[PDB]
Amino acid sequence: SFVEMVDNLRGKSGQGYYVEMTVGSPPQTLNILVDTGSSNFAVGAAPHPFLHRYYQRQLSSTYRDLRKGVYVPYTQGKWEGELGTDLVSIPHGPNVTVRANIAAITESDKFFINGSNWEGILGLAYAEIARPDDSLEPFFDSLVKQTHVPNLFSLQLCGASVGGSMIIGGIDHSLYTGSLWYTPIRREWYYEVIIVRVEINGQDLKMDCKEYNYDKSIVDSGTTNLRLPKKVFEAAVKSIKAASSTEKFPDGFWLGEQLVCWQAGTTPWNIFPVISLYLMGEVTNQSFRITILPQQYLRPVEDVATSQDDCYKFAISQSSTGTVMGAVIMEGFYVVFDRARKRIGFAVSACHVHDEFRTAAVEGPFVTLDMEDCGYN
């Protein structure tokens, strides 16, 4: 029954992927950002310059006030509001209705994005990181508890104005090619995984693998970039600089500030290396790798001048909260959040990114000793 959910995601580049939902009785329609990096379901519930519509609790006969406040600080942006519950549906999702916790957003700072076309956020990670605390049941937990929808979902985020699929309750085999490879969810709070090796253009970075997961590695559809811990970021940039030294770049480009352009159609893709992340596998001493093409970490942005060149921003950036595998890693992969079996699956997406002589890949098996030592404590 998954064909009804194919292509149920939309978005604008760098502004996230959202799915249509309805809340309340009668149903109020809102676009909701899908975010595996948080665990709160929250919606605009009051006028805001960037909102063209919002949730109106007074108009819903099924609304219940929980008479308790709440706020959530993200990396950038935050909101506060009122907790309550209401009936929620996903039109292009499973044919069910659930009563879910909803944070009605009454105030916010840099949360909503001008022109993003979404009015709320769907936190799909675990109760452990819910605000105010882990007793506030996340939406997907409610869905699974109240219905017969199996305890997993999958995301196919496609690049170029963007679209994708959130298959709720299963895996749609027409969305990927090749085999699915699975890495354990290390702990159910964020979708935390363990990176055991990193290579750039086939060359091992040769760092202590704990550095890759310091202080954690997570899969986060609410983040645009691949984000890397300071030491790893510097090693990666040094290596990517070396490989592309043929050309000169503004150092503000490597900081993700200045975009670089080339004459439309002449982007020197070949001088930018592929990046391979090796993830812990399902059996002893076994891992697998996902390989990212430059077409994924050089994100296309519109011309800041009058010309019609191809311009790009460097979409790898430094993190102080661990590795974040954001949308640009997830794009061109089919990612399965298999909560029931505590694992995340990766396969080459059907909407995979193209290079002339190179291809994004998910490959295994590999042997990797002492993978347990890669986890940071």
Ligand SMILES: CC(C)(C)c1cccc(CN[C@H]2C[S@@](=O)C[C@@H](Cc3cc(F)c(N)c(OC(C(F)(F)F)C(F)(F)F)c3)[C@@H]2O)c1
């Ligand atoms: C407390 C809590 C929630 C567990 C937490 C605190 C810090 C870091 C994290 C890890 N996950 C975070 C990383 S943060 O960069 C984005 C956040 C979700 C989010 C909040 C926002 F305000 C906005 N605008 C947003 O839109 C982005 C973008 F436009 F790129 F900003 C777009 F559009 F790309 F999606 C996305 C996600 O959840 C969780």
